[PDB]
Amino acid sequence: EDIPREPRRIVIHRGSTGLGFNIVGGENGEGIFISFILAGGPADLSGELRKGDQILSVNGVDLRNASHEQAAIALKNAGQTVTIIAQYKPEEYSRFEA
């Protein structure tokens, strides 16, 4: 596919269904991962985010060592235009989530 291995920058605009994705992780050995992408939501329309992406940063707020609630608050407070730094790690996601 066209998804690279290294971190990538994706710009999302918030709407009436939020940023259009939901998250898991943030405990133990597991960072913040996208578990669900809403059909037609902002993340879906970008074409850029995937289930199994780890969110490394949101608008400059580092989420590599954040709990789930710290990450959910940072996403809720990130404003209308949100820049997500994501890194695609589907095998690590499957280890924790399957």
CATH number at 97 reads 2.30.42.10
Solved by what technique?
A: X-ray
Whether 55 contacts 86, CB under 8 Å: yes
Distance, in Å, from the CA atom of 95 to the CA atom of 98, rounded to the nearest integer, reads: 6
- Which structural domain, as residue segments, surrounds residue 55? 1-98
Question: By C-alpha distance, which of 9, 1, 95 is closest to 55?
Answer: 9
Q: Count of domains in the chain? A: 1
Alpha-carbon distance of 75 to 54, in angstroms, equals: 14
> From CA 24, how far away is CA 60, in angstroms rounded?
20
Q: What is the DSSP letter of 96?
A: H
